[PDB]
Every structure is written in structure tokens, then in C-alpha cells.
Amino acid sequence: ILSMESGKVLRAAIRLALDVIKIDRLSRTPRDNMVLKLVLNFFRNVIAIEPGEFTINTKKSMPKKGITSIDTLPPNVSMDDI
């Protein structure tokens, strides 16, 4: 989302919001304000995505090798993109 030609989908989302905004306050149905909530929720999803946590099973004893990494990253995704 953030990398595809510097995030034109954000401009698409704000265009879908200003489709609602151009209507007057009295003429706006609650579905249009729900579309505004959809756009604001989309921006909170774009911001709010963070790398996950590394969960281990502690029923068995930890061996002599121990934890070698806690990296939870996809192949093409780096920490700079996130």
C-alpha cells in the first residue's frame, strides 16, 4: 500500500471521502458518514500495522542452542518499509 507509486490508493481513499464531503450536511445520509468512517478506518489500518511478536512453546525445556532469532518478517519486507 505504501510503496505502490508512493501510495496512490491514499489519494483514492480521500477522493472517496470528498465524494461524501461535497454533499451538504443536511443532505448527507448516514451511509455517507459511514463511508467517511470507512476512509478514516482505512488510514488507521495503514498506520496501525506493525511487525508481529515471536511466540514460543514453553512446555518443553529450552535446549542448549536457545533462541537464534525473533525476526518475524516476510522476504521482500524490510524494517524500513514498515
Binding site: 480521500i14 470528498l18 464531503i21 461535497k22
Partner: peptide, 20 residues
């Protein structure tokens, strides 16, 4: 410092036109 919505529409259309 109030931010107008019509100013944001005008800036959106103008930066669509030339983007500076």
C-alpha cells in the same frame, strides 16, 4: 488557525492540475 474544507478541495484540484 481554522482549516477550510473548500481550501482543501481547491488545493486537491490545483495539485491535480500541476502538482508544483
Amino acid at each position: 488557525k481554522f482549516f477550510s474544507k473548500e481550501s482543501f478541495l481547491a488545493d486537491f484540484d490545483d495539485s491535480s492540475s500541476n502538482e508544483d
